[PDB]
Design a protein around this ligand. Structure first.
Ligand SMILES: [Cl-]
Ligand SMILES: [Cl-]
Ligand SMILES: [Cl-]
Lengths: 255, 255
């Protein structure tokens, strides 16, 4: 188990941000509206988890200085890292700054951001890459967050083959000229190569490891493998960080 | 003066909405550190306000009117100066954006638009710079954080306002925009002040005229719709804005 920012620095891994977990988020005469609860970034802006994401923004602001490419790929070591939380909150935070952001859910097998943004999943990433849908037909707007999104679409029979099609390249090149920041949420590296095939058309790449769940080893093993591939892995993010119990104990099995 | 909708229906002028005045804003209202970067924007501040509910109604009427008519450009002009045309269009922009819709707002009042001041965004690269061929499209499209929609400001006042609107990039812009946004709102200078609305109106698919409660007369309004007619511009109707119930009067004027 990780649990400590410096517990990564020692491995040489640079941590762009440490994000604590929100407890309020676990608690979770006509007029007509839409969408459902809950989106932390807009609901509780003062939240401690959100304030940290802003610090994540300030970090990328520098980091992402003169790289020409404005596509930032977010991925995790393994499943349940809270990477979708980090990425979606980052999108909201950056957009809120008067910035044009495009969020794409590249987890063609298990992306669920359509549920989080309470948006349709009929036309998404898979339909486009397969050639069924034109680009403008798969880009929708997440009202509550104030940014544009592309859901995963209907789970395809050939996830990986689709990610390698030329259309993924056309999309990122196109997207890079129309948005100030393009966030790509991808499957964990320790689960599929997908992040390596897409991480190769991106300027930045941040791996998100969860406090306690991830062993500082795999976060290096993940970055290492993305390095074998042309992927330009910058640092890492420590998500989950939960503290103050006045004792001495945690969790993390040893392999 | 003029107060209806009935007084408007009379001259055949079809009224899509009646927006009451907002006392909550008349006062300007105002219900650590690191603050925002804007000013009071009713649509997101007091959402349940009666002026915003009126706009929602406008949305509904516009939805039926803009029923399978394909062209998604909506031009909102006024009969005369200070008719509240910007409060109306900016509010509608926000409302429609919140329904998970990609919207583009453009200030086509190259001489007195102030929407950049309202959205408190930059005004160095705007419509005028783009129309003159100086700037590029992606350069002039910015994002309004609070509202959640994309905007294009006027830019620096050009020496040849009208000549630029007849350009060619105006059309080129509008049709390009029509393919990347679900809704395109174009704010134009008062019809009885310049010919601009009629030159731009020839590329919009729908047009609305906003008349102010008490300041306008059922005369000048139908006169504007008429001269827009001569130019071959789809003027679907009008909007009564400012309506302040529970009151009286104390002015004077006529023609
Ligand atoms: Cl996840
Ligand atoms: Cl294009
Ligand atoms: Cl005006």
């Amino acid at each position: 188990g990780v649990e400590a920012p410096e517990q990564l620095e020692e491995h040489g891994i640079s941590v762009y941000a440490t994000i604590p977990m929100s407890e309020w988020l676990d608690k979770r005469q006509q007029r007509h509206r839409t969408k459902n609860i809950p989106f932390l970034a807009v609901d509780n802006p003062a939240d401690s988890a959100v304030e940290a994401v802003r610090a994540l923004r300030t970090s990328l602001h520098f980091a992402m200085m003169e790289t020409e490419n404005n596509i930032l790929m977010i991925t995790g070591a393994t499943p349940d890292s809270g990477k979708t939380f980090v990425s979606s909150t980052l999108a909201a935070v950056i957009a809120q700054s008067d910035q044009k952001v495009l969020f794409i859910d590249a987890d063609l097998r298990r992306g669920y951001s359509h549920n989080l943004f309470t948006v349709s999943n009929e036309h998404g990433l898979s339909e486009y890459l397969a050639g069924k849908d034109e680009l403008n037909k798969v880009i929708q707007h997440f009202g509550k967050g104030g940014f544009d999104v592309i859901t995963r679409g209907q789970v395809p029979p050939n996830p990986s083959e689709l990610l390698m099609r030329d259309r993924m390249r056309q999309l990122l090149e196109w997207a890079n000229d129309h948005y100030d920041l393009v966030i790509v949420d991808t499957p964990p590296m320790l689960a599929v190569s997908d992040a390596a095939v897409v991480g190769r058309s991106v300027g930045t790449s941040l791996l998100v490891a969860r406090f306690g769940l991830n062993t500082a080893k795999e976060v290096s093993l993940s970055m290492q493998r993305l390095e074998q591939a042309g992927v330009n892995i910058k640092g890492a993010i420590l998500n989950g960080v939960i503290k103050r119990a006045s004792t001495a104990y945690s969790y993390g099995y040893n392999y």
